[PDB]
Amino acid sequence: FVRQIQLLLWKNWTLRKRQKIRFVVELVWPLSLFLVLIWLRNANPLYSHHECHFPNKAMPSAGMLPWLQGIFCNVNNPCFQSPTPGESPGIVSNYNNSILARVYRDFQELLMNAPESQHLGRIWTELHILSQFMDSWGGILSDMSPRIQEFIHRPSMQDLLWVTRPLMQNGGPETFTKLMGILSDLLCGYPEGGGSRVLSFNWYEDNNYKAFLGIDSTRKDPIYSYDRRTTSFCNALIQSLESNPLTKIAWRAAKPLLMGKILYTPDSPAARRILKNANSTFEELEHVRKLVKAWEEVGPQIWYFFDNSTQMNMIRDTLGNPTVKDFLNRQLITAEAILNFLYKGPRESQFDWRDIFNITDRTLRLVNQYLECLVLDKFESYNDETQLTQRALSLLEENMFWAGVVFPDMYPWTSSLPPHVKYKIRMDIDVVEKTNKIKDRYWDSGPRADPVEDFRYIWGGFAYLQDMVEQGITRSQVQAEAPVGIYLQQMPYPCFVDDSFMIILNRCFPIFMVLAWIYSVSMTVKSIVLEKELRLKETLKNQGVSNAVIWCTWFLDSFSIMSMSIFLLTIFIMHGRILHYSDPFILFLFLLAFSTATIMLCFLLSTFFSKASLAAACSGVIYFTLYLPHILCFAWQDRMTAELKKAVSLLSPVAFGFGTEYLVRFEEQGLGLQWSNIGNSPTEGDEFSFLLSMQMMLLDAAVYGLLAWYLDQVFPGDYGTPLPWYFSFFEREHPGWVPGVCVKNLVKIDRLNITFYENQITAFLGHNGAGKTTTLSILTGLLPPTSGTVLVGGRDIETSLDAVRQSLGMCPQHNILFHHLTVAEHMLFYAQLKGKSQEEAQLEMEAMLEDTGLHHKRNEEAQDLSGGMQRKLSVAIAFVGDAKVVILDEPTSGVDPYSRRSIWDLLLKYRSGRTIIMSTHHMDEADLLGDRIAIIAQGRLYCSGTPLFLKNCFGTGLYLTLVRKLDGDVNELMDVVLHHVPEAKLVECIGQELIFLLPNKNFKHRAYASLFRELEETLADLGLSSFGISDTPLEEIFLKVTPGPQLNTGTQLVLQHVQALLVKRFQHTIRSHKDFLAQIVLPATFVFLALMLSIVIPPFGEYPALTLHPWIYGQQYTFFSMDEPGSEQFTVLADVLLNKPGFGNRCLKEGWLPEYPCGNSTPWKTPSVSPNITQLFQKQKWTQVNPSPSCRCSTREKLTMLPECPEGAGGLPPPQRTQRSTEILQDLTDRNISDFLVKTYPALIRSSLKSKFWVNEQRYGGISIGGKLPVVPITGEALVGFLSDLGRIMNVSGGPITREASKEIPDFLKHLETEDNIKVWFNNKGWHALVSFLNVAHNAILRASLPKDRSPEEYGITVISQPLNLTKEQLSEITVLTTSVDAVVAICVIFSMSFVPASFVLYLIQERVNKSKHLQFISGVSPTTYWVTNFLWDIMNYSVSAGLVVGIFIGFQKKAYTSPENLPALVALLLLYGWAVIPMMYPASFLFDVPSTAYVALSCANLFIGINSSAITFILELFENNRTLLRFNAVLRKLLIVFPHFCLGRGLIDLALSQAVTDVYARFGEEHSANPFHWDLIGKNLFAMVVEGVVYFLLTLLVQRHFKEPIVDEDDDVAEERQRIITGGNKTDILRLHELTKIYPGTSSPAVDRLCVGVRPGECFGLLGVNGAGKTTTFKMLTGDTTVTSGDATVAGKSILTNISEVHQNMGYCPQFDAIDELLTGREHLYLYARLRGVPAEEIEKVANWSIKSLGLTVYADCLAGTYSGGNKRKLSTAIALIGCPPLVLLDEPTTGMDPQARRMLWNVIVSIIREGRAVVLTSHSMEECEALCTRLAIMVKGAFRCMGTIQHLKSKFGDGYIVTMKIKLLPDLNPVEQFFQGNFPGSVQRERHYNMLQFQVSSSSLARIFQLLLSHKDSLLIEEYSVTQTTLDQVFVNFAKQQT
């Protein structure tokens, strides 16, 4: 058994090594694919970021001073790493580190709190007040003098504020960068420089395709109109800012805020009150503007006082201090004197009062001029949403539109606010997040904190407006007890890494690893099915191998070659840095499991098929289709049950995907795939794991293998035996010969007995019906008998079947040769398989190689051997194993006679004790070879004996053959013959030949001897030329045992051709399954799938409204922080936040959304924690810097997506409550919130992160009550009074504006910055969380300030977001995606529609690869009419298919194509595309030569061409650049017209574009009436496509239309024929050749050389040929297939070179290789070829019936011609040849594979045709056929006719003498006869001698002497039986072939 595995393994390895080209691709293809994967890896670096804590962003309810800071210092979202001061429990300022803050802190720390400074100031103020009324001090001032000194001393001014601020003071500072650098430090102190902003890399989200393609199209530039009714200065300013590429996005994003408007619809007095109370910030800013403007007037008064007042007298007195008060000046002077000089001014020098006053003047005038044209009256009224939107578009096109507030509940007469007030905010969609989706689809592992594209509710202007409106509503409904502000504070985020690869390596790795093995699968299945197509599997099984061994060895071979590639690929992956952290061994095992599943899938796939090419073409596609469902099941894994998963894992490719998902997800989180963490579901309770996936793949492999084995063993091909679904006429036998196979008493339901002998080559003869096949089956081990015994040398079949199989060779009818194996390896392998050892096999192989004659091709491929040598090798390998019994089956079936003789020589050399048993159909072979023939018929063994015994037992008399030169008269021949022997019958007379018959009973020897003496002496006197005697041929014995109608021509004949071709095509297509499937099904299903995947995207209108509450995010955790519990208002605020109404609005008393009901709650439980954590926290005293165990980030070589980090992080869990709103609420009161969030978020997301699709983080925000922003201890009244008194002293009166601005100062001061605010933590990874929790906070603020007489469970504020309608550009940008999906649909449609003509080309190739096309061309059909009729049929069929596809399109009701104004365009496009694509692929039928290879190439080419020609032009049209894009696209668009597919692709795409544009203009409301057939849009495609189709057809017709030496010496007959042709050329010679000569190009050796013969009517000029002489060539160019080089071949006078149609109508071909359509019925072929031949229609039945009757075959007449066998096929071809009674009828091997009693019938018909008077021309290898039916043979050796003449004359001159065989009575009696022949006949070779019978070969023409001697000495020689014969014709041809070499 193991020997079988070893042999098959060695053979498979040898074959794989021999192929040598599949091997390289095998090893290279996956390496190239995964090198592409490596390059993808190396061009996608991973983004790693440090911990990220953010500052808080103030809101307009926190006063305009902090809010402004929070909109200038936080335009970048700094993201520091250390926590900001703003996240501390009770601190909100976040800016104690700016220069101003520190300086002011110092200013308090030495001045306000100073013990004596306040007293000194009060004293100075009192003294100043006294002096003004009039109109023991000084020591206090000196005491203050040191205090200001160290106020200067503190290092907030020595360096800071005096090394930074003066930097801009020298000259003009740079405008943009370092001014912001200094101002940021001057206003907000921020550590670590400024911090690094996080970026956003989710381009594919938000559906912003500009970023990926890199398109610099921002937005249309806003319309400019000079007159805004505003000062020209800032009209010029807008001119400047709207032009430069610098500061163009910033101004476009900031103009709405500073200058835009706010439009509110209801206009009711209540809305007016709401938006008057929501107006505070604008009053504040406008008050600041008034103050700045009033300084403009107050200033000149200050200057006038400073130079013109009593202060001049005071300054003069101070200058007089050296004359008055020098002591006081010197006590503390010169610096004061310098200030006094400045007071004096009139000084060129700098650093004086003039300079500081001038700089203050300049800066304040500049600030006033800049501020003077803001817009602080933003509120405009309207009446309904319609006018609001109509004005909103008009404003927005100018880019002055902030937002629009709409109250959906109050009519224009409303006066009292309802409890549940509701409003909506409408804005442009470039300013608000989209309102249809609430979460990013694929979870990026970032914080989503990039200020430009993540935050858009903040810089856009949503949150500010919402805060203003909600504080307005709050202050309107309730009183003003105390105001509290709102700070938004983004939640912190842990330290992440963003690996952009993992998305790619998720989906791509499966499909790449499947494409890696789409070639190996095809090769393996092709090999497996090819081994079974050529019947070698049956041969192997017969010799003894089991069925399991074949499967096991196929598996081992494939597994070895695949394992090599898997090892290479795994090393390549691991050391190419695609996977970073993974045990390579487990990855290798995973790949091996997939390979095993794939190999067993190949085993199963090979079971369905039976062809070779078809399997190789289709198996890879089947493999890919099997993989395909994993793509569908990849976006639905969040709803897919584990039970479903395991069930849908039955496909190995699908299982691969489910494993690589865990591969990538384990590689991403850092640990990677290792042994310990395998088989464990990474997510929580998936129950699906890697190890179980591998086990499922192994189970898949086992199931595939068992199913394949059962299916094959139950459904074998045409060759195996399917299993049930369940599973005196006999020569005396002289005792000398030892019996070899003594089968006796055999029965089967044959009833016979016969004993084959030791050495003699017994021939077995029969009709194949009554035996000779079943008997050979029982004799071998193939099949067991019933009630019989077959004794093979003493080992009965039933009893022993091991030794019998060991010692009985067998050669089947077909040869048994592996490809790619040399003869030596074949012979060694076949010797070993029988059972010898290795060395014995080598010795036997060498010896029998020497005995065979193939030793010179010792190492030559078994494909390069010629057919004769292949058959000889097969017969030789039937002799291996030293088999003492051999059973051939038709040796030398179709080999040329020389190889036939060679195989006979082999058989003679190996008959020494072998008991050969040949079963043959030929009769000469069974006679010249067999030593005893045994015939069986009816099941009876009729006779069996020596061929001499049969020829002399019931054999007819010896016939007589005579030939003349016409020139011999008949009467005298018969006269003399009958006079010598009066019992002679002239049995047959043919031209130039005469055949008699003479009996052998009363043999009358003297008369015979006289007859031959007379015919030899007087040979030439009569008309004779030669004569001979033939003994009864064995074929006769074996058989005995068991004029033309008128033809149409002209124009009716062409109509006959058209009708006949059309009917033939239709009748073939109507009865075929596969054409209909590839013609009606596949296009329909592909179009249907494309359309079904088209409508999956619903049409989009305008963005829907979406109310704003947190519970749109599902189930979540939200916390709070009760801080600063002293204040009663905050206590009741906390109570309202917790218990009374709930968190937001869900449990409102009256009602709320009906989809969100709320129930009861839980009484404030606390989670239970393991004692580990309690002991951990008790054992170590954690400081306040770190309260919880710090947990580790992603270090090097351990990069983790989120930091896995130990238990106990974040501290003990806080008490919880499942609130009424059904949202678990925690309570972080005395507990770091930032630290807790940071070290709790990882585990929280890990517990909820499966598939990373629409993931739900369990916490989205919370509200932290309490935060105290310190405020200055200055009241408004004191400040204004101080300024008023100061102005009173310095003679300052102001005026109107200084009074209108300095009158409302207390409210201005009170609204500046607020106090006791609250924080709103918000997780921004949910898009609408910020505004939602802002709304919740304001609801709480409202509900906490009620007057306690009204229940707080019914008051609330509800915000709704819904954007305006989209304009031109946004609508176009949306419609681009629909255009893209329609383009994909168009590509799929062209692919589906191109599936149709590929079948047409398939049929064309299948018909051309036979001779069917050429045979029709011979019958008389022009090329042009052939192609025209085929084109008409193809057009009609494609019209049917396109009508079906149009119907499918209509079914879907697609408005784009099926509109009544668009349907004609679709119909025309489809029909014309067929019209233009069919002629394009007509020429492709000439290139290929095998269906299932042309189809793949045509489909792939069509798909690729369409994809490129559509996608390239569409994408390039999407662009706008003109360099390398626009002109190149235009020139490319013109070139790509040459492809028909491009044309219809753009047709469909342009129809979609026109429909989209019309849809847009209908939505806004216009009319766009572009009809599709407009030349620019569609109509160039139709014109160009039609012209292209017309050009293609002409090109196809053109391609079909296109692509001396002196006479050497010869014998007498060839030269005589030459002269009979050249001179006195005959008139009646039907076919006359004239120096026909053809030389192959590039060989300089003539294939033929100057043939010259003519054939008379009634002369079967059989034309033989030595192998390679080119008889095929002379036929191929006599018909017309191959062009002629010289000479001319006239037929019935018509030449062949010039006019050929008459020749074709005057001849009838019969190709060697049968050419018939496998679907048309038997009678239909005759119908067809009769119609082409032109016999009229009314009598077609008569001719068809004559032809069907003449050839038998009448019972197979009406049946599909593919169901016939070889004999019936040849009969049909012959009947086709004789269809119209043509004068010349040119056959070529008429009878191959036919059995006697049928071959005779075909020969008879031919003989009758010959006798009618019409010539024929034969060509064959079976020389018995020629000798039977031809009358003028001619042998052609090397391009020339070696010999010509009648059969008898040829075998006279060329042939040797008569062969006389005779037997004596015993074996000793035979010796004496011999020397008698040695005496009288000196020339005597004994050809063969055997026991009791010796056959002399005497080369003596004078046979009369042999006759008279052998009948005078009949007694004395003891001669009982004898026979005289003559050297047959084959001997002559073998002599020729032998002398050739």
Ligand SMILES: CC(C)CCC[C@@H](C)[C@H]1CC[C@H]2[C@@H]3CC=C4C[C@@H](O)CC[C@]4(C)[C@H]3CC[C@]12C
């Ligand atoms: C319009 C004229 C010229 C041509 C019409 C051709 C039509 C009739 C042909 C084209 C494809 C054909 C089908 C192809 C395959 C099959 C499967 C076979 O098991 C039954 C017949 C059936 C179902 C054929 C019915 C006839 C059919 C629909």
Ligand SMILES: CC(C)CCC[C@@H](C)[C@H]1CC[C@H]2[C@@H]3CC=C4C[C@@H](O)CC[C@]4(C)[C@H]3CC[C@]12C
């Ligand atoms: C992906 C696309 C382009 C190709 C699909 C797979 C190709 C290779 C397959 C699918 C259908 C197959 C054909 C189905 C039927 C037949 C008829 C048969 O008498 C010859 C082979 C032939 C013509 C096959 C050739 C190979 C084939 C064309």
Ligand SMILES: *[C@@H]1O[C@H](CO)[C@@H](O)[C@H](O)[C@H]1NC(C)=O
């Ligand atoms: C930070 O801000 C507040 C303001 O008083 C306070 O915590 C502290 O004084 C400031 N300075 C620090 C913490 O250095």
